[PDB]
Amino acid sequence: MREIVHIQAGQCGNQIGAKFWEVISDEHGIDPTGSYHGDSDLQLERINVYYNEAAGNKYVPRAILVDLEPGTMDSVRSGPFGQIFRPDNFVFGQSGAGNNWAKGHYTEGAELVDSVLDVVRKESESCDCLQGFQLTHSLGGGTGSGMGTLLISKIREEYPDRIMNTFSVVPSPKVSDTVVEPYNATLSVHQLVENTDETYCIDNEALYDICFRTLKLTTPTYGDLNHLVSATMSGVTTCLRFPGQLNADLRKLAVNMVPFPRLHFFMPGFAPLTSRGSQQYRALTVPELTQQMFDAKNMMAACDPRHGRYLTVAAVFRGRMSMKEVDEQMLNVQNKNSSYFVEWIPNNVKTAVCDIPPRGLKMSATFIGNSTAIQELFKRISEQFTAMFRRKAFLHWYTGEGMDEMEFTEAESNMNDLVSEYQQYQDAT
Amino acid sequence: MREIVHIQAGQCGNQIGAKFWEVISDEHGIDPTGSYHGDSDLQLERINVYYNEAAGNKYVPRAILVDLEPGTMDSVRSGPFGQIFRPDNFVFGQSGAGNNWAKGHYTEGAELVDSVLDVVRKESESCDCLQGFQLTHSLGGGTGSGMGTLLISKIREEYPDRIMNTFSVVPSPKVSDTVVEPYNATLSVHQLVENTDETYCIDNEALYDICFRTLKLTTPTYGDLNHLVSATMSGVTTCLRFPGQLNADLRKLAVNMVPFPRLHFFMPGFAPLTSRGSQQYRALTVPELTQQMFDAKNMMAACDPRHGRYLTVAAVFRGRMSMKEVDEQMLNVQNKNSSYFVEWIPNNVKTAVCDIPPRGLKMSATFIGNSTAIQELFKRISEQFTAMFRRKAFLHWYTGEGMDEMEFTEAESNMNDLVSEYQQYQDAT
Amino acid sequence: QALSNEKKAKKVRFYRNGDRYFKGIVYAVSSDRFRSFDALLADLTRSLSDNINLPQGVRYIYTIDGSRKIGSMDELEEGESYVCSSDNFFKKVEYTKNV
Ligand SMILES: Nc1nc2c(ncn2[C@@H]2O[C@H](COP(=O)(O)OP(=O)(O)O)[C@@H](O)[C@H]2O)c(=O)[nH]1
Ligand SMILES: Nc1nc2c(ncn2[C@@H]2O[C@H](COP(=O)(O)OP(=O)(O)O)[C@@H](O)[C@H]2O)c(=O)[nH]1
């Protein structure tokens, strides 16, 4: 049991998912047809969490793909592992978002949100024991900010107990891929703090550095950028799909990592990340994988963790290894960096150990670290919002879609409530 | 025994039947010559219900084909499986209906109804134990509304005990294929509520949506529309022609589905209905076939069942399956949709399970659901009648055929008696 | 000045005629999206009738009460529903119950 329904939204969240389902099919051994060509019977035992068995030994992904124009869905069905999806799940409109939250959430979302929830409710009944949903979108564009946050509110009113986690892409601070991205981010963080459980903030700028510096890549396309996000998304639920010595899941991370009902924005991190030639000048041990998860050059949210304190740390390991060798390192990085952790939470490291490695490697990891260092991320969104709102510019595109100036006030005031909270628990006593 | 005499009328009812006898011959294995080329001996055991054995191992359909002009009968004998009918049964006049109920029922029907009943009475004596008749016509045109309802009254005066069911085609609400179709429908429903036992209301508009949306067809001709009606007509009597675990027939559905001697207008429904490419992304189980029979997008009478309550539900399944798996689903859709069923009839679902599937599939179904949702169908006929009668327009074509204004009064008042009854049993206590 | 006239969308609801099981979609009705009232009938055409309602389309917009035929867009007010019909005859059912 414990099945998961995957929801995609926007141009960004589709292309993340279109690489993500390639990664999951590489573990469980699924051809682009949809049949099975594996070697181990452990791949087929927990297969139901991301699959429904069709008639004739074929498996389909439990995915829901949402857009407002068919310019992206045609790319998904044409690419490899595009025939694997069911043709009913491609729900899409015709008007297009226009890179607008107000078009994505109020007007053109309302003509489509009823068509999506029929696909949601059909997939919810077919599962035996529903574990929880997951969503992949972006806070910059129109669809992933508007249509996504509309789907979160409609689900939470109908499922007030299931876990709901989003791999949201927060816009980078230096470059700006959208002129109105301080409006799309601020009007969507107001939705996320009240209707989710945990949220994995990913910045684009941190992903460019890892391919450039750490992996030593010359021409990083998005297929090499999204492959790091998809390897992170598989690493969160990798103990739910495989037997392990110490097991955790989406529920246990939602209890451990989240000590307060608002403070639930995380930052991910993956290890090991070698080069194409430097993968022989490195010994793959647990203390080697430990000292790569914690440095600043291997985060994914563009914020140095040294500016704030950690609160909770999850370290999901994969592959066979000594439990003593794990428990020694998780104590070791907690003693010497004693100022970098919060004091009134003792033993603030949650450990999970799977057994089966990723395809190709011997052992791996996945860093899920909550911190106060993401107060810097909401400084720059709250500053760039007020820099653009005090002149009331780029505003008539949102007023004409049924919105007032008071909605911008409560959304911004909700964000400065949040930065006051991370500031308070940095200097507790 | 238990033989059935099939009667066709009008241009519509002939072309439905001309595809229907192709479907029955595909089950029992009959060539266009009339010989036998089957594989299983179960096809020849109950063959007598729709056939009479001729001399020399040839079988003929027990059909009676009626028209008022030979423009349609020439198309039947020229098409494939047109040589299979007997040349004596083609009873047809020369004047033509003129798309007129008053010509079809009074004047030109009287010169032909004596010639039809000699063919009826000849086929009634050749059968050993007569099960009952069936009729295929339409309430829009001239012949199927006038000549058909004249044949129903002449049969019921001579057979006051046999079952009499009609697959009448009720005209669609939005488009209008006939200017005077509120007159042909109203003057024929007055005949049907007093001389039949059960009636399967089929709308054209619902059949266009199923080929467009559900089957994903590009160019639906009537051969693809009538193939859904003929698959429904075979599915009603499919337990009478084959052995099954739990058996029902035309008599048992007339007792279960009909709790009052007037409230007997049904709506059909067929499942499964895949696409040409989407037939592999679907598992054929009993809970899959259950959740397709009950939604609004797979009815055949243009009325959403959610506007009213059900009263009785027949679910004739085909193919080998678990009886527990059927009885669990027929309880499951009755508990969660508890407001959508009538209260003072408990366990309002009749189940019948055959053994032999249709040609090509593994398991199938047939939904026969009575409801109060067909009060909307008789609102629009009763409204469009009074919108055209208060000006007394298109009326001189009916007065000149021997009719008064009082006949329009009692026919319309009979219909508002019927809508008052379905309104009353929607709010019982 | 630059803080302009605040081109504002009314938030009005549209119950379609007769359909008791219908909620009414809030449209961003402004003077910028519709230069004329006759253009407002065009947007009401596709987004109200799907399979079973309104063969005549959209002709007459009534009030929710309803005792008045809506003229131009100046006869609309912010935050009130309107019964959208397509004939002279009006249906008196409880539209606004349980929004
Ligand atoms: N990481 C990543 N971000 C992407 C990708 N494609 C688009 N984006 C992000 O998506 C945002 C642009 O919005 P868009 O994808 O069109 O979404 P929508 O406008 O809401 O439909 C920017 O923040 C881009 O950085 C991709 O392949 N990878
Ligand atoms: N479903 C269906 N309806 C048909 C077909 N052919 C004609 N009709 C219907 O028949 C009606 C027209 O009347 P007609 O068939 O000429 O019958 P008549 O005038 O009484 O002889 C309309 O309601 C058509 O929709 C067909 O192949 N399939």
Residue numbers in the entry:
A (entry chain B), B (entry chain b): 1 to 429
C (entry chain N): 44 to 142
Text of the article:
Microtubules (MTs) are cytoskeleton polymers built from αβ-tubulin heterodimers that associate head-to-tail to form polar protofilaments (PFs) and laterally to form the hollow MT wall. They are central to many aspects of cell biology, acting as tracks for molecular motors and generating force via their dynamic growth and shrinkage. Furthermore, the structures of most MTs polymerised in vitro, as well as those found in many in vivo situations, include a single discontinuity – called the seam – in the otherwise helical arrangement of their subunits. This seam is composed of heterotypic α-β and β-α lateral contacts and standard Fourier helical methods cannot be used to determine the structure of such MTs.
Binding partners attached every tubulin dimer act as fiducial markers and greatly facilitate structural discrimination between α- and β-tubulin. The determination of the αβ-tubulin register and seam location during image processing is essential for alignment accuracy that enables determination of biologically relevant structures. Here we present a pipeline designed for image processing and high-resolution reconstruction of cryo-electron microscopy microtubule datasets, based in the popular and user-friendly RELION image-processing package, Microtubule RELION-based Pipeline (MiRP). The presented method is fast and semi-automated, producing near-atomic resolution reconstructions with test datasets that contain a range of microtubule architectures and binding proteins.
